[PDB]
């Protein structure tokens, strides 16, 4: 519970199932949705599916999904040091169908 500094941008490295990693220039503010939007597309941007971000733990072999309101940074700052945690972009990853 101690945050008070903002200067350089936050280069979030989001990896895709395929493997290709796509980074995006964001700053303390962009949520897990801002990335989805950017990644998906910027120009025009109709809407496309909801999509989202999924934090992967390349150490504990874990996979946690975050919402849109969720802050990739805030969530990224949560990740421990002893774990090169990262984000993943997927539209299919949960338990139980919903379709909305």
From Swiss-Prot:
Post-translational modifications reported in the UniProt record: Phosphorylated on serine and threonine residues in response to heregulin. Phosphorylated on tyrosine residues by TEK/TIE2. Phosphorylated on tyrosine residues in response to NTN1 signaling. Phosphorylation promotes stress granule disassembly during recovery after cellular stress. Phosphorylated on tyrosine residues by PTK2/FAK1, and possibly also other kinases. Phosphorylation is enhanced by activation of receptor kinases. Tyrosine phosphorylation is essential for activation of down-stream protein kinases.
* Domain Ras-associating residues, every copy: 8-94
Q: Where in the cell is it found?
A: Cytoplasm; Cell junction, Focal adhesion; Cell membrane; Cytoplasmic granule
Q: Which domain of life is it from?
A: Eukaryota
Function of this protein? Answer: Adapter protein that interacts with the cytoplasmic domain of numerous receptor kinases and modulates down-stream signaling. Promotes activation of down-stream protein kinases, including STAT3, AKT1, MAPK1 and/or MAPK3. Promotes activation of HRAS. Plays a role in signal transduction in response to EGF. Plays a role in the regulation of cell proliferation and cell migration. Plays a role in the assembly and stability of RNA stress granules. Binds to the 5'UTR of target mRNA molecules and represses translation of target mRNA species, when not phosphorylated.
Quaternary structure, from the entry: Homodimer. Interacts (via SH2 domain) with EGFR, ERBB2, ERBB3 (when phosphorylated), ERBB4 (when phosphorylated), EPHB1, INSR, FGFR1, PDGFRA (tyrosine phosphorylated) and PDGFRB (tyrosine phosphorylated). Interacts with SHC1. Interacts with RND1. Interacts (when tyrosine phosphorylated) with FHL2 and HAX1. Interacts (via SH2 domain) with RET and PTK2/FAK1. Interacts (when not phosphorylated) with ELAVL1. In stressed cells, but not in normal cells, part of a complex that contains at least GRB7, PTK2/FAK1, STAU1, ELAVL1 and TIA1. Interacts (via SH2 domain) with KIT (phosphorylated).
The similarity annotation says: Belongs to the GRB7/10/14 family.
Q: What note about domains is in the entry? A: The PH domain mediates interaction with membranes containing phosphoinositides.
The name under which this protein is listed is: Growth factor receptor-bound protein 7
Q: Which organism is it from?
A: Homo sapiens (Human)
Lineage of origin: Eukaryota, Metazoa, Chordata, Craniata, Vertebrata
The encoding gene: GRB7
